[PDB]
């Protein structure tokens, strides 16, 4: 029926309203030699000999012209579609400027000759799908963090914060520690083997200090399989890798706050009366959540921070990686919402103002 | 490609029509004097991938394009793939003839998975699905 | 109508394009006084009194002055044909500096006036004519060996492996282990005379240790007749000399790794998602693979170095002794061919640098 | 007096201090059969017929079991005297875990019986005897490559790099484009000879394409006398081998970025304010820079990358082959050393946690 | 400091007197014996910077604090640094000996601001100047 697509900032995921998850996820980059340009999985393949540059990143649009490019693959080459045949609903960051939202319905009436069109927030969608209309929200995705407070249906502008630092620097992180059990990762071909030991033997540990000291006496390791055959043995780096999260000192970042201070700091920046309500209504989301023990380990490092007649409430759904596409797939199939939609005949007799009034 | 053959005027339009699932799979054979690539049959989206399996003949390589479903986990997930078949009980001229004919087909079937299948074990399911699902980072 | 030539390094090939097997085949040798020179049978039926020297040995050119009297015999001598009046299609080894590609045009131009000029790659000819697009090539010749992975028709230039260490060797030590059962082959007359028994009655053992064992007890031994019409017997050495190919020690090369351990390091210098495809396409080619169940014990030898989830697959064509050859006298035959000749127009206006850019 | 030792990557040097150079230098080797082990030299003459491996490579220990026996080859066969008797300073590579170190001083106090142990930092070491304080610190071994940044007398540990591509890749590159004019040098005793050449003759081209194209038509080579007292004749080999380290992409290695970008991607690691001093103390070490007219070219390249505002300085001095090794003596040989030990019965009263507090 | 040297009783006196504006420089180097940092050259107000540079020596490397003034915009500014002199020509045992031993200085120099120099070129006043200026936040 109609499309949903979600930028994010470093995959795209797209598909039809009514399904239950996305059937295309694809990297949003773009390669040219060291066919003119590369874009999503054709320049992963040549990364090679491919300079690679990111149309979005840190959650914000910073090439137009890579960017149209990100758009024209999924319609052609991933979804198969005609962009002039069905109704796009698309998805912004927080604290987007409006000049980024005015030239983004732009290219889709006159370049794409898109119908519909509508425009939502990443941050109220994802909000709504957890049956919540008061709350704030952590969004951990791999270019950015960030948190949301919601109250009422509405975000405060005045209490949302960047960090810049997300599950991409893990990757470096656990790729850099992993060369003191010997060899080396640095060709981008072993750059996705590390990923995907990311994605399934890292997990949180509750007590990290305590971990440290027993991983030795007990040199436990596992085996993952290479693409080649051989199997590769991982040890205490499992665990490492996700504390960057809470401490990102070990980075470099002595700045960062990390997550128990970033909650905190972005709640006391609202009003005193309403924040006993937010403390309750912590929403995890992003993909970078995703780590075992993960909810556990943050209740209780917020709970330090906040005075003892507060006892704050974490609320992690099983299906917070992909928050913000189904709940924008299920607002586009409601059958009353035929009448929510932008016309582009709407676009004609008013200009690029239309999109600020509606949505 | 350095045997020197093209393609016909047909085979763009075909291809097209294949991405947009408007067919099945469009199977390209060398014509008959042997100077093109030219249409030869095109699939409705009825037939599955099995019944084109019987069709692999061991005395006529051929060039197949099919949109493959493998149906991951309860998802109804599809691919795009160029199967090049030539058999090794064919002749001596017809298997160097193809194989140095296949560059001519990479300027049209961008986007297409290249497999290479030379036996009937080569033509198996879990063959294909393996392969698609490496380039796949998701 | 064209002419075919394949240098080689202990034999040349030559005839016409659209045939199914070469016509002349003669060894590319010089003789000089130990006729002021002698080039091919001319030196070997005078080899007594005459001091030989190899142009090509090892697959490298090493002398043009010496090369130039080779193509002077085939052209004149052997093909008894115009080089001003015929198309010339040739080969180079893998590996082949520039220098040599620009000097071997730059003879068939001004010295023969060919009017038009074709060089091909030995690797690449003899995999396509197997029906394959990717795969590894062993190539066993006379004077040098080569392990050239080609993946979608270009080579990998920092897989390439040279040996030197073929058929040639295998001659002399099956000529040294001949006098244990007396008389002697030193002349040069006796020396053919090796290599017919070679080429005849030799053959690869798979289990080489048993074979010796049990060959004692049966005192087994074959008659083979000389020109002169007596009779000699040949006993376990058939089966001693290929076994040099897989364990290169019996001749004084410890450092030689052999033919299974040759693939085996030639496939790890490659990419990791791409070893997986090159084990399954391990294609044999040359003269010195022509023994009796040597693809049968290769396969097994290097099943053992690769891992547990690798079944390697090795292919044998019945032609793998021509494959060069045959591959380029097909292609030559098409009807297609004759736009992708250089013609001497394009040498004239352009100079050597011709040759790079095409072919 | 004392015993400074630096193990090293393929070679180890050992002395006493207060002396200007080393006195014995022999790479660090491990040899089976194909005595039970050889060690050094003596596995070295024996190449041939055993299987060597490499205790430290890449500058990490890897094999503690094997490690001992190098360091045992040292005191006795090497240096012939008493562990039990002198006090001996180690070096460490940048970036070691705290394991290794433990377990360094554990083998000494426990095994070797040392009175008293330090040990340094190989780029602190290096920099001090330059006269400097703050700056950067480039050094190339033959396993392994690193890039430290100093300030103040404290290096930055989230700006340090590895490349694992020195000097000991370039023997073998040089060793294989040296089969273009013939000949093989497959054999371990050939492989030596090749060294020889490279310590010899080699040296860095100021400009690389200017080089290429007038030795062809120069065609100048040089002699080089063989130990069985042929002549071999060197052409423009001498200048394409040094040139791997410029643009590492001609041994297959596209995505290591070289030594004039692994400079520039360290420096911006750190903190802006910082930048403009590290840039005007580049210090080279190592015995892979001590190629001809490498500092000239190394400035030129470094000065492209660096914006209009910043002019970089390259410090190269004459003893920067054994720098690490320098530094130890001249520190051991002060009077007020004695003080900066750590002694036998500490360790006993303390346990290996005591050099995480000292040195 | 990891070589292990001290300073003189009479060295942190001097440093106080040089910063109640009682001298203009005083130059320190390590004694005869090697053991021990002492004071060596005091220099009185009268005296600039321009002729207390002259008087580095090329073969000597030394610790000169001095009390530097820049003539800001008409504004009579100054500010104490210390300047570590270690000339590329020195011996080698020299250099390293002064360089590890910079460390005993940073318990008494506080408020000094260190500059490190290995050539005429370093000792420039623009340099100098460039370098104060980039610490202040006025
Ligand atoms: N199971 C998992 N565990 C940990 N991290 C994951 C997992 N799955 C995905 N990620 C990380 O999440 C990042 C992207 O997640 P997501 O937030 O959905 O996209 P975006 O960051 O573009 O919004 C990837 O970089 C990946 O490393
Ligand atoms: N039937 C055979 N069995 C074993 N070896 C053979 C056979 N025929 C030829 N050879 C060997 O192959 C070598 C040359 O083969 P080929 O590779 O075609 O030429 P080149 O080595 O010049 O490329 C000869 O030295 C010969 O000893
Ligand atoms: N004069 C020279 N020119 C070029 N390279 C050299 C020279 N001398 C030694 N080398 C190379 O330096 C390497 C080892 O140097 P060094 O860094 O001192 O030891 P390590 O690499 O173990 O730290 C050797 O592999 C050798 O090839
Ligand atoms: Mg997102
Ligand atoms: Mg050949
Ligand atoms: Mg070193």
């Not at chain 1, 209309?133 to 963090?145: H, M, P």
């Not at chain 1, 059990?181 to 990923?195: N, P, S």
């Not at chain 1, 997990?203 to 971990?211: C, G, I, Q, S």
């Amino acid at each position: 029926s109609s499309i949903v697509c979600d930028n994010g900032s470093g995959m795209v995921k797209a598909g039809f309203s009514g399904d239950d998850a996305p059937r295309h996820v694809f990297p949003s980059i773009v390669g040219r030699p060291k066919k003119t340009v590369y874009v999503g999985d054709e320049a992963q393949s040549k990364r090679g000999v491919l300079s690679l540059k990111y149309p979005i990143e840190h959650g914000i649009v910073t090439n137009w012209d890579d960017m149209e490019k990100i758009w024209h693959h999924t319609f052609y080459n991933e979804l198969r579609v005609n962009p002039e045949q069905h109704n796009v609903l698309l998805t912004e960051a927080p604290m987007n400027p409006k000049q980024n939202r005015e030239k983004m319905t732009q290219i889709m009436f006159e370049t794409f000759n898109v119908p519909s069109l509508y425009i939502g927030i990443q941050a109220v969608l994802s909000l709504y799908s957890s049956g919540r209309t008061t709350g704030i929200v952590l969004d951990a995705g791999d270019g950015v963090t960030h948190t949301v407070p919601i109250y009422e249906g509405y975000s405060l502008p005045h209490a949302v914060r960047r960090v810049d630092m997300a599950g991409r620097d893990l990757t470096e992180y656990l790729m850099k520690i992993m060369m003191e059990t010997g060899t080396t990762f640095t060709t981008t071909a072993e750059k996705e083997i590390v990923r995907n030991v990311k994605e399934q033997l890292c997990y949180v540990a509750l007590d990290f200090e305590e971990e440290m000291t027993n991983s030795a006496k007990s040199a436990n390791e596992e085996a993952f399989e290479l693409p080649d055959g051989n199997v590769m043995m991982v040890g205490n780096q499992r665990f490492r890798c996700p504390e960057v999260l809470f401490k990102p000192s070990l980075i470099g970042l002595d700045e960062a706050p990390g997550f128990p201070e970033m909650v905190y700091q972005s709640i006391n920046k609202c009003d005193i009366d309403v924040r006993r309500e937010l403390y309750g209504n912590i929403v995890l989301s992003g993909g970078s959540t995703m780590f075992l023990n993960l909810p556990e380990r943050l209740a209780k490092e917020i709970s330090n921070l906040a005075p003892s007649s507060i006892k704050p409430k974490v609320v992690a759904p099983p299906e917070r990686k992909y928050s913000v596409w189904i709940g924008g797939s299920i607002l586009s199939s409601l059958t009353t919402f035929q009448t929510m939609w932008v016309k582009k005949s709407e676009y004609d007799e008013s200009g690029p103002s239309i999109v600020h009034n509606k949505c | 490609a350095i045997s020197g053959v093209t393609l016909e005027e047909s085979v763009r339009g075909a291809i097209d029509d294949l991405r947009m699932k408007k067919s099945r799979y469009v199977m390209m054979c060398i014509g008959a004097d042997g100077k093109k690539i030219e249409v030869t049959e095109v699939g409705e989206r009825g037939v599955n991938y099995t019944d084109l399996k019987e069709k692999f003949s061991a005395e006529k390589p051929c060039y197949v394009a099919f949109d493959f479903e493998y149906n991951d986990a309860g998802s109804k997930r599809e691919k795009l793939i160029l199967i090049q078949w030539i058999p090794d009980t064919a002749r001596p001229r017809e298997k160097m003839m193809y194989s140095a004919s296949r560059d001519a087909l990479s300027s049209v079937s961008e986007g297409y998975l290249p497999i290479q299948a030379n036996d009937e074990s080569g033509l198996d399911a879990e063959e294909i699905i393996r392969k698609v699902r490496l380039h796949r980072s998701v």
